[PDB]
Design a protein around this nucleic acid. Structure first.
Length: 54
RNA sequence: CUAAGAAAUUCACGGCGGGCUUGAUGUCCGCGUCUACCUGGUUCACUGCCGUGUAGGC
């Protein structure tokens, strides 16, 4: 549980978003660790075989 | 101010081997097609006393 310093080392994406009146924000996106991969793998190998043979 | 902004894939190859498709068959019967028309508004034609001489003759 430690961070360091906020940065975005020159190759991470960061994209202007138009504010309503005027102005922008830089909005650096970060890759999430949402695991739909577990829900994808368990619905393709675990009991996809049993439902598929039925 | 665009998940922004950048990017040489690069190369080669033996698909080969062989072969019985066979036989048989009933298309089979009919039939009312009628009726009336102007090719005519066109053949710039053989000559010749003729002038071949762009008008000139029956």
């Amino acid at each position: 549980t430690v961070k360091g310093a906020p940065a975005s080392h020159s190759l991470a994406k960061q994209l202007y978003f138009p504010l309503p009146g005027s102005g922008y924000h830089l909005l650096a996106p970060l890759f999430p660790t949402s695991l739909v991969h577990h829900v994808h793998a368990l619905l393709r190998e675990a009991r996809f075989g049993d439902a598929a043979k039925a």
